[PDB]
Write a protein that binds this ligand. Structure first.
Ligand SMILES: CCC(CC)CN(C[C@@H](O)[C@H](Cc1ccccc1)NC(=O)O[C@H]1CO[C@H]2OCC[C@H]21)S(=O)(=O)c1ccc2ncsc2c1
Lengths: 99, 99
């Protein structure tokens, strides 16, 4: 689809078998989801945002279906203000900015 | 133009007579610029992201050129690590997400 920006670009995603709402975030390098359980091994990591650094759990090679499009990649889980889809997965679904 | 998301979508902007690099950021409601001593009235604001909140100064009706496209609106100035063009200006320059 083409998505305009007068509203937040929120979309439904499917991950670990569950549906969630997430924000398409071109300013995020990484995909970061609010606290949730995911299967398999994870690694402790830290990432920084506008307000400082947080601790996250890094899960690699995780399938997510974003607005009907498949991605498989790194998902960070931790105290983000909102679920965000970052560039690591936006690239997989062929997302570009256009003006 | 079309901007892919393999790298950060940094573009050149001009504001208050300075040229800067800034993110075209669909995850940002508002535009947030690195500390700069702009003239005019402002209002204090707090904005939240990963890590917590920062304190910013809200300036209204500031002209800003983004990749050659003129815009005018609210800009928040404070200790962000990156200049961020948010949806309030992205809409003015006709920017969409496409996949
Ligand atoms: C609430 C939704 C997100 C935070 C999740 C909002 N951010 C915009 C992001 O695009 C931000 C923009 C950003 C970019 C770089 C540094 C700081 C902020 N990116 C960001 O936090 O990305 C993190 C995940 O991937 C990593 O790559 C970049 C930082 C990490 S923000 O910068 O905090 C932000 C910007 C404008 C704004 N207007 C009103 S509240 C508000 C908050």
């Amino acid at each position: 689809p083409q998505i305009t920006l007068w509203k937040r670009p929120l979309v439904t995603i499917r991950i670990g078998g569950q549906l969630k709402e997430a924000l398409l975030d071109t300013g995020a390098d990484d995909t970061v989801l609010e606290e949730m359980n995911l299967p398999g091994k994870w690694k402790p990591k830290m990432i920084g945002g506008i307000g400082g650094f947080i601790k996250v759990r890094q899960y690699d090679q995780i399938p997510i279906e974003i607005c009907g499009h498949k991605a498989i990649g790194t998902v960070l889980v931790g105290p983000t203000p909102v679920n965000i889809i970052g560039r690591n997965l936006l690239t997989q679904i062929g997302c570009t900015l256009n003006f």
